[PDB]
Design an enzyme around this catalytic site. Structure first.
Site, PDB file in Angstrom:
ATOM      1  N   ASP B  10      -9.489   5.368  -3.759  1.00  0.00           N
ATOM      2  CA  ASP B  10      -8.561   4.407  -4.341  1.00  0.00           C
ATOM      3  C   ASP B  10      -9.379   3.219  -4.829  1.00  0.00           C
ATOM      4  O   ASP B  10      -9.894   2.434  -4.023  1.00  0.00           O
ATOM      5  CB  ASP B  10      -7.511   3.983  -3.317  1.00  0.00           C
ATOM      6  CG  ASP B  10      -6.683   2.794  -3.778  1.00  0.00           C
ATOM      7  OD1 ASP B  10      -6.516   2.610  -5.003  1.00  0.00           O
ATOM      8  OD2 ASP B  10      -6.189   2.047  -2.908  1.00  0.00           O
ATOM      9  N   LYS B  71     -11.114  -4.607 -12.661  1.00  0.00           N
ATOM     10  CA  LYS B  71      -9.988  -3.722 -12.928  1.00  0.00           C
ATOM     11  C   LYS B  71      -8.984  -4.375 -13.869  1.00  0.00           C
ATOM     12  O   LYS B  71      -8.267  -3.676 -14.593  1.00  0.00           O
ATOM     13  CB  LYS B  71      -9.317  -3.314 -11.616  1.00  0.00           C
ATOM     14  CG  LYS B  71      -8.354  -2.141 -11.740  1.00  0.00           C
ATOM     15  CD  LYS B  71      -7.771  -1.769 -10.385  1.00  0.00           C
ATOM     16  CE  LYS B  71      -6.812  -0.593 -10.480  1.00  0.00           C
ATOM     17  NZ  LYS B  71      -6.171  -0.307  -9.166  1.00  0.00           N
ATOM     18  N   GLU B 175      -1.494   6.044  -8.925  1.00  0.00           N
ATOM     19  CA  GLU B 175      -1.445   5.533  -7.557  1.00  0.00           C
ATOM     20  C   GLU B 175      -0.087   5.708  -6.881  1.00  0.00           C
ATOM     21  O   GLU B 175      -0.067   6.136  -5.712  1.00  0.00           O
ATOM     22  CB  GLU B 175      -1.882   4.061  -7.548  1.00  0.00           C
ATOM     23  CG  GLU B 175      -3.321   3.862  -8.004  1.00  0.00           C
ATOM     24  CD  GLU B 175      -3.726   2.402  -8.092  1.00  0.00           C
ATOM     25  OE1 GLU B 175      -2.944   1.531  -7.653  1.00  0.00           O
ATOM     26  OE2 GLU B 175      -4.833   2.123  -8.603  1.00  0.00           O
ATOM     27  N   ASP B 200       4.891  -0.521  -5.596  1.00  0.00           N
ATOM     28  CA  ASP B 200       3.473  -0.781  -5.338  1.00  0.00           C
ATOM     29  C   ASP B 200       3.111  -2.126  -5.961  1.00  0.00           C
ATOM     30  O   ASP B 200       2.938  -2.229  -7.179  1.00  0.00           O
ATOM     31  CB  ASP B 200       2.608   0.344  -5.905  1.00  0.00           C
ATOM     32  CG  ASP B 200       1.147   0.250  -5.468  1.00  0.00           C
ATOM     33  OD1 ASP B 200       0.719  -0.815  -4.974  1.00  0.00           O
ATOM     34  OD2 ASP B 200       0.421   1.253  -5.630  1.00  0.00           O
TER      35      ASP B 200
HETATM   36  N1  LIG Z   1      -0.106 -10.304   5.040  1.00  0.00           N
HETATM   37  C1  LIG Z   1      -0.113 -10.521   3.703  1.00  0.00           C
HETATM   38  N2  LIG Z   1       0.794 -11.335   3.120  1.00  0.00           N
HETATM   39  C2  LIG Z   1       0.797 -11.562   1.792  1.00  0.00           C
HETATM   40  N3  LIG Z   1      -0.081 -11.012   0.938  1.00  0.00           N
HETATM   41  C3  LIG Z   1      -1.047 -10.176   1.385  1.00  0.00           C
HETATM   42  C4  LIG Z   1      -1.117  -9.877   2.824  1.00  0.00           C
HETATM   43  N4  LIG Z   1      -2.153  -9.032   2.990  1.00  0.00           N
HETATM   44  C5  LIG Z   1      -2.695  -8.809   1.766  1.00  0.00           C
HETATM   45  N5  LIG Z   1      -2.035  -9.489   0.809  1.00  0.00           N
HETATM   46  C6  LIG Z   1      -2.361  -9.475  -0.637  1.00  0.00           C
HETATM   47  O1  LIG Z   1      -2.408  -8.119  -1.090  1.00  0.00           O
HETATM   48  C7  LIG Z   1      -3.584  -7.879  -1.864  1.00  0.00           C
HETATM   49  C8  LIG Z   1      -4.270  -6.597  -1.415  1.00  0.00           C
HETATM   50  O2  LIG Z   1      -3.434  -5.469  -1.657  1.00  0.00           O
HETATM   51  P1  LIG Z   1      -4.107  -4.084  -2.127  1.00  0.00           P
HETATM   52  O3  LIG Z   1      -5.239  -3.733  -1.190  1.00  0.00           O
HETATM   53  O4  LIG Z   1      -2.999  -3.087  -2.371  1.00  0.00           O
HETATM   54  O5  LIG Z   1      -4.723  -4.520  -3.548  1.00  0.00           O
HETATM   55  P2  LIG Z   1      -5.361  -3.469  -4.585  1.00  0.00           P
HETATM   56  O6  LIG Z   1      -4.944  -2.073  -4.191  1.00  0.00           O
HETATM   57  O7  LIG Z   1      -6.821  -3.807  -4.774  1.00  0.00           O
HETATM   58  O8  LIG Z   1      -4.537  -3.917  -5.897  1.00  0.00           O
HETATM   59  P3  LIG Z   1      -4.266  -2.956  -7.159  1.00  0.00           P
HETATM   60  O9  LIG Z   1      -3.390  -1.860  -6.600  1.00  0.00           O
HETATM   61  O10 LIG Z   1      -3.564  -3.868  -8.134  1.00  0.00           O
HETATM   62  O11 LIG Z   1      -5.633  -2.492  -7.592  1.00  0.00           O
HETATM   63  C9  LIG Z   1      -4.509  -9.071  -1.679  1.00  0.00           C
HETATM   64  O12 LIG Z   1      -4.860  -9.619  -2.952  1.00  0.00           O
HETATM   65  C10 LIG Z   1      -3.734 -10.087  -0.865  1.00  0.00           C
HETATM   66  O13 LIG Z   1      -3.629 -11.308  -1.601  1.00  0.00           O
HETATM   67 MG   LIG Z   2      -3.881  -0.499  -5.155  1.00  0.00          MG
END
Ligand SMILES: Nc1ncnc2c1ncn2[C@@H]1O[C@H](COP(=O)(O)OP(=O)(O)OP(=O)(O)O)[C@@H](O)[C@H]1O
Ligand SMILES: [Mg+2]
Ligand SMILES: Nc1ncnc2c1ncn2[C@@H]1O[C@H](COP(=O)(O)OP(=O)(O)OP(=O)(O)O)[C@@H](O)[C@H]1O
Ligand SMILES: [Mg+2]
Lengths: 591, 597
Positions: B10, B71, B175, B200
């Site tokens: 991912d 990204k 995704e 998502d």
């Molecule tokens: N407990 C929480 N409360 C609020 N926001 C959060 C919390 N934990 C994480 N986040 C937010 O969620 C984000 C991380 O989510 P995730 O790992 O799905 O991102 P990602 O998969 O890299 O994003 P994308 O799917 O757009 O590529 C972080 O940027 C953070 O700001």
């Molecule tokens: Mg993601």
């Protein structure tokens, strides 16, 4: 709505970890932040208590009310050397009350003194609530972990902390043994007799065990360790060096600012975790102390040289457990690593060199194995494949009494399998009082006093004729319960204990439980009333923008709502009722 | 020593997550720090490329050379509006190369330009390495995840990035479809037909998908979203408010200090995470700017007010997926949450209110479900997973693929929601006698004016058989494969004959030569980093030896001379590990010979 099973709670010095087992698979539970490990921090605010990442974030902001390292302080006496030194190092203030240490914090606008069992009970409550969010039901049965080298006072204090957290502690399991459950059941199995050495170097405690695994029977052959040795000591060495470089390059000394010490400690921990992967790193921080920036390069070789005495010192309990069970290095079948500090390459090179280049077993997760095994044991003890599971643990240090001349008389020796019954005879010089200790030194001044024990009802006789049978029983939790019965005249003799440490009467436990429930209630009240007042004020603002007989009724209701907004005695439910009433009335009048 | 299976990675905006599936169970693999999610940060030094939390932790120290958020940059043009605003917010320098954006860094002592596929390839290589230490074998096949609303340029971009990372991309999986696999197979399976809504909200992208789940058949009924909406936008709002308050309380501005913006941004993300659990928090950061301390309090209502328009906006793609799928709110069986930003209680409140107070499903892990499903499809595709588990994936195109007519008016060829793979056609013809070229722009999107669509490129069809005006019938074919990538072709139904197509003004496309050269450069970079590690460690060991034999010798002329030679060799920075080790051995012969006397 009540979970009939039991959860496993690894209560660590630095991080805690909760997991659950339902007979088919063991799952580690993630907290509200998505992290499977929750830091063991508890900070105090004006209206609530923060536990976990929230408390560790506000550590540098409020160091005097952010509590940590309770595991190194629980079950100990105030004037022990380790707690005097730790107290010299800790930023928060610890006070002495009748011999027991209790932290002093600013909470709910008043000064509060908490015993370590209460703070550990807060952490355990947090982990239990993580489990409750995962399961959706109330959790009340749990298995809690302790280091294998915990003495009687520490184990009893930890169990009492589990009781204050509202949990039915079904079992107190040793962390290396739980890791042995994770390793022997998970990656391995087979009815094959094998010798496993468990090397658990965590954040504050150090343990090493030697177990014989035959199918489902886990027999602890020996164990050694040090309950006050972990990664934070390495952080302390690197921190001291960095302080020497700061005061060397700026003439200023930062020792008097707990804030700067907290930030520098965080930077040193980050640098340490970086050095496990790379060969060098750099620390750059602004202001630090008295507006003096800091920038230094730390080499892996410098870190290893700064922690050479401790790194090499970890090999002493390995040879100790090797000799105690009477096996040689060629006969050690596997060497499993448990704990975050095991990720240090110098440690793994010391262990591998010690066993003549033997490769180390790293199939289990060094951060979740303890909570894994604890979860399995809890699921078995609550009846939720593996029916041959048997746990034969051991007492780590001798439990005895003080002889004439204050010489240690062991009643239950170290290496004794658990549970056990031992007996020893006393008599009268003409009540009988004797001091019970735990440890391994000849002179009881160098041992851990379990307490002054007094036998209350004695018949009146000549000296020597009465025989007093004293029974030292050690249960599966590894905790000592003593009784007394004399063979002549039969009868039973109740015992009283004075100058003890780490124990709490049922009354004090009930009081701490009720106080905890009152704390949580006050927190929910503050949060719900806060958010409710925010929403109500917003809606009132919108209604004012809209209005700018019916007019007067609207204005009056809005004035009542503002009054409820100003009164601190208002409850969130009443605020919701006022907002809803406003919406009803304004919609009726508008329509 | 080559792993026969395939891994599922991912590739997220903020965090990446690797996993493997062999037939029985699917493992989420932890990194060197024991973390199952690795941040998508790549910082450059004088000798090495740091990838992961090692790169993210030095973001404040080296903000000009620490790269992230690619990204949100991959597959885009330099003059796109989002690219311009993000470039105004990013501390690293982005440079336009014939219209293609390129991150410019100071690396190996020299200036370096990189395409987003190269940095994404570095992240993918890091996750691949994690899987490789986990498995003990070299892996070369993988299934890489893209957001559902990713367009054609972006998909080709990250697939090429998977090629540069040395991987065989067996499939590009959406995704929400991977999370749907995680929920339908991992959370629990039933032979009953159900309509599953997936929400998502990650770090930079936003997806909503409605799938029909019937045992092992996963059919994407619809999907919508916004590829440039995430938690970092909320962090940006709170950061802008914090700059307003700082300038208000100090009459000074920190908008010019990159380290200050990084510290304040970290404190804002932390304060958001805290606000998801509590009703208020405090930001206290000392010497933020100009030796001025910063201390304010942030309430949850302040945060939700700062992000009220975006939070309220997240509901529109849900209504869009319900309209497109022809499904009412009652007919939705489960609402599953994916992405870290889903933990925001305001978002869950909005979602539950949208479905008349229905409870949202939180059974799967919101951080590992995508890598879960991707690892499942990778294991099935590689053949390593056999028999155990009938899995069928029927995905759709997110946005309509079409051409531009007279007046720059969008004519769709492949409509949105069309199942994949697919073949569509559209006829063109000439307007003059003996006309040799017919040229048309291919776009993706839904708006009528292609000014608001995404240009896929200028397509030139030439030559054309010499016929009179409007006589040739030029059948143009829009084919969309299983990865969701568009390939266009052209034929002349009169006399057949494949007609040549040329593409100009493209984006996210790389020729095989450029990709191979990027792979070679990656090999040179890893080789240089391992080399630097060897010279460094050999140097340190030689230092320790010199100190030891100083203590020993001070308790002989050839040993002193060899010592001086070893120190002089140690003062040179161009010393090889073989040369340093040779000098250490030269000392060792002398001192060990003296030790035996
Ligand atoms: N407990 C929480 N409360 C609020 N926001 C959060 C919390 N934990 C994480 N986040 C937010 O969620 C984000 C991380 O989510 P995730 O790992 O799905 O991102 P990602 O998969 O890299 O994003 P994308 O799917 O757009 O590529 C972080 O940027 C953070 O700001
Ligand atoms: Mg993601
Ligand atoms: N990559 C790493 N390199 C070096 N040290 C590390 C690394 N990762 C974690 N640590 C150390 O490991 C410690 C935490 O490990 P662990 O979770 O086993 O502690 P714990 O179980 O809470 O402690 P204890 O067992 O003493 O109660 C931290 O102090 C941290 O400094
Ligand atoms: Mg531990």
């Amino acid at each position: 709505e009540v979970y009939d099973g039991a959860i496993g709670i690894d209560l660590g010095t630095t991080y805690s970890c909760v997991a659950v087992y339902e007979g088919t698979n063991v799952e580690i539970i993630a907290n509200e932040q998505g992290n499977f490990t929750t830091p063991s921090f508890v900070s105090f605010t004006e209206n609530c208590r923060l536990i976990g990442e929230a408390a560790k974030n506000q550590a540098a902001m409020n160091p005097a009310n952010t509590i940590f390292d309770v595991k190194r302080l629980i079950g100990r006496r105030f004037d022990d050397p380790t707690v005097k030194k730790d107290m010299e190092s800790w930023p928060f203030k610890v006070v002495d009350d009748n011999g027991n240490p209790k932290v002093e914090v600013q909470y709910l606008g008043q000064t509060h003194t908490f015993s370590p069992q209460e703070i550990s009970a807060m952490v355990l409550t947090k982990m239990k609530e993580i489990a409750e969010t995962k399961l959706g039901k109330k959790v009340e049965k749990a298995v809690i972990t302790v280091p294998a080298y915990f003495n009687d006072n520490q184990r009893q204090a930890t169990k009492d902390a589990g009781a204050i957290a509202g949990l039915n502690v079904l079992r107190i399991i040793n962390e290396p043994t739980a890791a042995a459950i994770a390793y022997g059941l998970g990656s391995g199995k087979s009815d094959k007799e094998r010798n496993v050495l468990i090397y658990d170097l965590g954040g504050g405690a150090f343990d090493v065990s030697l177990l014989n695994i035959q199918g489902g029977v886990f027999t602890v052959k020996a164990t050694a360790g040090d309950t006050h040795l972990g990664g934070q000591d390495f952080d302390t060495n690197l921190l001291e060096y960095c302080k020497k470089e700061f005061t060397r390059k700026t003439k200023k000394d930062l020792s008097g600012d707990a804030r700067a010490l907290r930030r520098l400690r965080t930077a040193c921990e980050r640098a340490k975790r970086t050095l496990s992967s790379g060969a060098q790193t750099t620390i750059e921080i602004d202001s630090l102390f008295d507006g003096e920036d800091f920038n230094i390069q730390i080499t892996r070789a410098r870190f290893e040289d700064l922690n050479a005495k401790a790194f090499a010192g970890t090999l002493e309990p390995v040879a100790q457990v090797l000799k105690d069970a009477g096996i040689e290095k060629h006969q050690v079948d596997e060497i499993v690593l448990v704990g975050g500090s095991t990720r240090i390459p110098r440690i793994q090179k010391l262990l591998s060199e010690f066993f003549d280049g033997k490769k180390l077993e790293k199939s289990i997760n060094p951060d979740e194995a303890v909570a894994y095994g604890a979860a399995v044991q809890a699921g078995i003890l609550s009846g939720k494949d593996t029916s041959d599971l048997l746990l034969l643990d051991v007492v780590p240090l001798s439990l005895g009494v003080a002889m004439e001349g204050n010489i240690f008389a062991p009643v239950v020796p170290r290496g004794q399998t658990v549970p056990t019954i031992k007996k020893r005879t006393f008599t009268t010089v003409a009540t009988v009082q004797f001091p019970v200790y735990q440890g391994e030194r000849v002179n009881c001044e160098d041992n851990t006093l379990l307490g002054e024990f007094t036998l209350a009802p004695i018949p009146p006789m000549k000296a020597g004729e009465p025989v007093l049978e004293v029974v030292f029983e050690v249960d599966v939790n590894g905790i000592l319960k003593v009784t007394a019965t004399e063979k002549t005249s039969g009868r039973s003799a109740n015992i009283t204990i004075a100058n003890s440490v780490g124990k709490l009467s049922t009354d004090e436990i009930e009081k701490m439980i009720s106080d905890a429930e009152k704390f949580k209630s006050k927190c929910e009240a503050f949060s719900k009333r806060f958010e409710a007042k925010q929403q109500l004020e917003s809606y009132i603002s919108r209604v004012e923008e809209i209005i700018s007989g019916q007019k007067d009724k609207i204005e009056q209701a809005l004035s009542e709502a503002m009054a409820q907004l100003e009164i601190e005695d208002s409850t969130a439910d009443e605020l919701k009722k006022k907002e809803l009433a406003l919406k009803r009335l304004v919609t009726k009048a508008m329509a």
